[PDB]
Amino acid sequence: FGIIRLILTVVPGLLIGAAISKNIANFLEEN
Amino acid sequence: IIRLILTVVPGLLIGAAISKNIANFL
Amino acid sequence: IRLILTVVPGLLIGAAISKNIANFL
Amino acid sequence: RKQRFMQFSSLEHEGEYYMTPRDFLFSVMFEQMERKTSVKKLTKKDIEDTLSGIQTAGCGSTFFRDLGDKGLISYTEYLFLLTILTKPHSGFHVAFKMLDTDGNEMIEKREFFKLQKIISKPEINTTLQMRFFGKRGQRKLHYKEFRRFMENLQTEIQEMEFLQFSKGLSFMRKEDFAEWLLFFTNTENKDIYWKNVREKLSAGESISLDEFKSFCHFTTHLEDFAIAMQMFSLAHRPVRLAEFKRAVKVATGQELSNNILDTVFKIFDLDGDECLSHEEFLGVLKNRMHR
Amino acid sequence: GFRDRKVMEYENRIRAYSTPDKIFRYFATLKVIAEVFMTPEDFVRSITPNEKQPEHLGLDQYIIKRFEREKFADEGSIFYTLGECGLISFSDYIFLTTVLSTPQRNFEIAFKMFDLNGDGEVDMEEFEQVQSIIRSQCSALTTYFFGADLKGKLTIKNFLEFQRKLQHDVLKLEFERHDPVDGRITERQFGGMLLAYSGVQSKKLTAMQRQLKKHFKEGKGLTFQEVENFFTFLKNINDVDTALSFYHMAGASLDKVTMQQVARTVAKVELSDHVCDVVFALFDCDGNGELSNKEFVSIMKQRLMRG
Amino acid sequence: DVKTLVNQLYEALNVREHQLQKEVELTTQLETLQQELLPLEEKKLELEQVANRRSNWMAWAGLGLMSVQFGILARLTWWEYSWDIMEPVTYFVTYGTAMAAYAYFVLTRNDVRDRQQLLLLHKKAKKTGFDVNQYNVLKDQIAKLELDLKRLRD
Amino acid sequence: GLSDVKTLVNQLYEALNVREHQLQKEVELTTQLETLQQELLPLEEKKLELEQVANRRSNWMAWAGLGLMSVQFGILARLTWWEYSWDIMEPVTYFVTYGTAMAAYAYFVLTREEYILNDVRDRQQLFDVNQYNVLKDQIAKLELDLKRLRD
Amino acid sequence: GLSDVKTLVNQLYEALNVREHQLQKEVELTTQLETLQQELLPLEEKKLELEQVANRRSNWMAWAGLGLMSVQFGILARLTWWEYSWDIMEPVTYFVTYGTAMAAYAYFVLTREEYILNDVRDRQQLFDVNQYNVLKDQIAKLELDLKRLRD
Amino acid sequence: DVKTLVNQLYEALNVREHQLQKEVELTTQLETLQQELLPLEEKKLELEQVANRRSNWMAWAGLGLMSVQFGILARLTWWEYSWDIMEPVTYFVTYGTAMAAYAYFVLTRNDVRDRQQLLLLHKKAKKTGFDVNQYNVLKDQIAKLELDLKRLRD
Ligand SMILES: [Ca+2]
């Protein structure tokens, strides 16, 4: 029953990291 | 040590064969 | 003193052993 | 250098020091004066008379020797000779280009002073000015005469060195050549070199003035020798006497004799092998060239 | 443009410190069927810093090409004699990049050493020795320098002429990579070419633009011939530096006429007014026409030696 | 001498019906002890749960942060940049993450293991109402009494 | 306190009543020690059984961890040295090492959280070690006293 | 053994002489608690002093280790991104990290060996924690008896 | 009645000279108990020093093997090969070293911490002549006696 929460914790963190790198690189190229 | 080898070596060979099969499948 | 006397001989032995093993190979 | 000027100057006029050609030669050969003679204080008329009885001297390689004590050197002039002795000649040619363009490169009496002041970094008549421009500055200095004069200076000082080591024997002995070679290098390694040469010289062999002149020329060209030895070291082959002769032929552009070059390879054969210890060789030749 | 600056700095680090193989696999842009190749433009890019690689090609990604074939170098160009239709393979890349760098005195000495009673005689084995020694400190060119019999002797004159032609062709490529119009380069672009191997900072170049603006010099252009004459002039930088220091200590001012006089006298090259104007625009002390001989010699030395 | 006197004393006070009296006194002292113990036990349980939630939350947050770093690095070296330009950045980010974990450690600081855990919990608390040593001697007294009761029942 | 003094009087009467105070007490000590050890036996058996049952599990789990680590090593070694070169598979091995460290951490976190939540739930809803240890205390003290009385 | 039964009789006598059985006994228990605590205080002083003098050392040592590691981090980053390239500074950083780890483990093993040698030597040549501990336990039992007597 | 009986018995047996008698009996009981404890402490010291020698030796061997491996890697990475060919070998050698360290750590297996350590050493080594339990109970009894003697000396 723990694996569901394990996935629900990891995968959103990983996706958030991807989107944050997207946005930070965009900002840096902008300014 | 005999059981240590009998645990490690088959795992490594199984990993090698699995890498073979996975690269072929991909 | 014992720290150096343990490390340095081990390192030199490793160097010589790699030399000899590479020659043999 | 100026210390040497004040130590060896033997004429004086109006609180100003002056050298004779004999003084100048003894200055270029030695560090200290042999006889601590007082500086004779001479007057205007007398210092003019010192240069009256000249032009009796042969304008070849005996120029300075023939002038003897009958000559005058301003401190600046003495600096200009020293650079000619130590420096390679090509730099002076560059100055001849810079001074005058599309011309014979003539200099006035004042321009001669300018040349001295730049290279080594009214007035009385002097031997150089009178020789080069005539008595009253009528002729002009064409580069080739200066090149000939510099060659004659080199040759004369070299002949003087050969006589001074020969002691008037008209030929040398290779131990004396070794002495001339290692002389200036005062850093203590000379004992082992002396041992090696004495073992490997085989007394009774001789060299004449032409060999000595050719080896001094090689001394002046030494840099190409260093590049060739470095290239051999990168090749990682031990340099051998024949290879040393090949490097000498490349550097100097001349073919030295077997005996002289074999002697030099033997002396600087620091190890028992047949390989030139060229590092110390270069060091010794550098010391020798800088005097 | 942040990412572009980061990529260009990374490329400069590759050029300056990486192994001669990484520089090849990274700057090569062709793959012929399997062997990698670099068009001559890529060879020029691999030596001049601050040049950007095309986005997609980069490292270990090439334009795979299928085996009259297309010509990548103009007829008569030296790269054409490499053997391909003007393409450079790694084997030739090392050879060309070691012929570009080493000074001609070393080649003279090496040729003089390994030979038999000959000033400029060399054979293939002796040539291999020379290459090894000089690289410490060639495909399809054997016919060019030795003949079909492969026993001809390369006279040092022929090899030095070949090296000179190589430098000339690389210079023409480096010039053309600046997009000339009517055959004239922008003063700022000539400043870049001159300072390309110098300090990274572009401040002085800006100051040059302001100087030319307030001097009516920007906007006249330099032909390729003028740049060639200027580099042949720089090919005597040692004697030029000695003569400059001499004229400096003599008391004369390092003005434009002094630089053209010294150029004529010690380099046998006729400089144009504009070229002296530009050298002075980016090399004066602050405003004055006196030249900063020391820094000038420094930068010109570190530029002529290709780094 | 004193033997018959202590015999008379035993006859007087120790009526010798003391076996069942011991049984009933034991089986009620046990209940009184348990009732005296329960508050200490509930305090201990509350303290344990309150010190458990913190570590659970912190561990899950640490895993979330590791995953976020993974995502940031995998989105840099495969879409925006290349791997080779982002090799030292990843090495130094890993070094910095290990250093930050070490700094977190330095800033935050069978049955015998439980005793040590309870001692550390009491020390970190300074929370009155739960006196660990009183609870320990109390549990020990209860265990001894219950064992004696098991002997009595046989 | 009447019960306390009653038990005290009983104790004093029993102590004075004994004959061969140094002999008969040694006998009663042996009997009591034997009886207490015979009482301790079931607790020790239960403890040993539970220890073995909770130890073989961890042994098998660590063995499985080693097997999985070796399998991963084999996969990486074959891919790096047979199929694709190392230059193309440097990022894959770095990120797989990262994934493996994260999975190890996740297993530790899962086992800790599950065990502690189960323990707290069982404690809130509810082999007693305390009486076993108290029995060890009583029996060691009895054996020590017997030792002192014998020699 | 006669002295033991005499002490039992003395306990009985102290029990029987009581007036205001539960009150004066509560008072005596209060005096006992006060006495035991006044005695306990010096041991707690010794213990807290030793604890602080053993805690500050580890704190400063860990700070020093972290500072050294940060210095190495900065040096390697500056040599990698400004002076040289990463292509040329990969083996240097790998072997510097290896050396740092080996030095940390060597320091750990050396302090362990020195500590165990010194401890065994001092034990062979020779704050009594156990009288502090039995003092804590006795005073707790007494406070518990006082509580039970209160209500 | 019975109170006067136990008072007469107090005068009879409890001579009341037992204060100084108790002092001298205690100052001798303490020596007796320490003389009893001594062999147990000797056995404990011997066992712990023998189990400490082994740990020291094994940790020294570990450091030696670490240094030998570092040596071999450095020599190859700078003399016999280039770094390019020795990156995968370096990574896989580090992986193998980690796997070996884990196989070793799997094949091997505040006063309460010391008590747990002693209990574990006794359970593992299980040598007769030393019982941790009797040693603990004797330590606590002699401690309580020292304490009573301090209270008596005042
Ligand atoms: Ca790498």
Author numbering:
A (entry chain E): 65 to 95
B (entry chain H): 67 to 92
C (entry chain G): 68 to 92
D (entry chain J): 86 to 206, 228 to 397
E (entry chain I): 105 to 137, 143 to 176, 184 to 253, 275 to 444
F (entry chain A), I (entry chain C): 178 to 286, 292 to 336
G (entry chain D), H (entry chain B): 175 to 300, 312 to 336
Paper text:
The mitochondrial calcium uniporter is a highly selective multi-subunit Ca2+ channel of the inner mitochondrial membrane that serves as the major conduit for uptake of Ca2+ by mitochondria and controls ATP production in response to cytosolic Ca2+ signals. The protein MCU constitutes the pore of the uniporter through which Ca2+ ions flow and EMRE, a small transmembrane protein that associates with MCU, is necessary for Ca2+ uptake in metazoan organisms. Ca2+-dependent control is conferred by proteins that are unique to the uniporter − heterodimers of MICU1-MICU2 in most cells and of MICU1-MICU3 in neurons. At the ~100 nM resting level of [Ca2+]cytosol, MICU1-MICU2 and MICU1-MICU3 heterodimers prevent ion conduction through the channel, and they permit it when Ca2+ levels rise.
